[PDB]
Symmetry: C7
Subunit: 62 residues, 7 copies
């Protein structure tokens, strides 16, 4: 198809795996990716759950 492996599809394929999320402020969050949505909001599970709002995200290393 078009668009190759879409970014949200790569996120779909990274469910239940450890990703690292880097935010515009410099902070990094590492933990299991348990959910995401169309805005690139992500749920990251480490010692506890973190919902990260997508507009803060610079990169995700899945």
């Amino acid at each position: 198809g078009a668009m190759s492996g879409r970014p949200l599809d790569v996120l779909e394929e990274s469910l239940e795996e450890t990703v690292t999320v880097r935010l515009k402020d410099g902070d990094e969050f590492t933990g299991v990716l348990t959910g995401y949505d169309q805005h690139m909001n992500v749920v990251i599970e480490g010692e506890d759950t973190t919902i990260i709002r997508g507009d803060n995200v610079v990169t995700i290393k899945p």
Copy 2:
């Protein structure tokens, strides 16, 4: 389905439980989550009711 546990579905299951919202300006708001919407606007209940506009949120930890 697709998307694991969507971020807004994790909010739904955090309703009436305690969460911490961290904003872009550095402020943190702890209290009971009593509502949310599509924009990730949140209602946090401490001694006061605090409506937080979604665009200010960095992370929500339930």
Copy 3:
């Protein structure tokens, strides 16, 4: 139903009550909430009338 006490619904129930609105620039406005819209634009009646563009809002405390 879903989303608990939706943020805008709490606004609806805060009409004609005193609220405090804090802006990104750190200013605060206290007065009677006489209107709002789906952007979280709000009308605050103090000594005189203030319309606040929602995109400046950080928190609203009803």
Copy 4:
């Protein structure tokens, strides 16, 4: 109805009357409001005519 006196409805009742618009960069513009739109762009007429793009607006005092 809902939302009380909507922010855009207050601007509707302030057409042909004097208002003060304050901008995110701190400038204020005073004059007769002669038009507006759903983005809250406004037309302010004092000695000059000024179209103000709504995303710059913090407050409007009708």
Copy 5:
């Protein structure tokens, strides 16, 4: 009508006339308004053509 003299309608009444556009970075552009769109992108003609993206616009003064 509603909304008085809508800001984009003022732009229409300014086509083929000289206006002054002030940007968020402080620069000012004076020239013939030869076009605009619904985002308030404008084409300003001085000694040459300048297309200005609307999200940089603070004010337009016909």
Copy 6:
């Protein structure tokens, strides 16, 4: 018609010609405009090819 010579229409008629794009960070890119889209993403080809995301654009000079 309305809106005069629309900005995207000026971009159409500047295809295959040389233009200067100035970004919010202050950088400038000069080259032949070989494409654009509704967001004002542009493709500029001088000695190499640069896709510029429209949200960074201040002005384009065709």
Copy 7:
């Protein structure tokens, strides 16, 4: 057709080819373009997979 070589179409033609993405914070990512979407989110394959959110992108140079 209209719009010449659309920016997203240049991206399509760059799949499985090395490109270089520059971000607003100054960082640069070089690697194989393996995916993209309509927001200009991109997936860049270097030593690791990196998902880049579009709104941080300034330029992409294939």
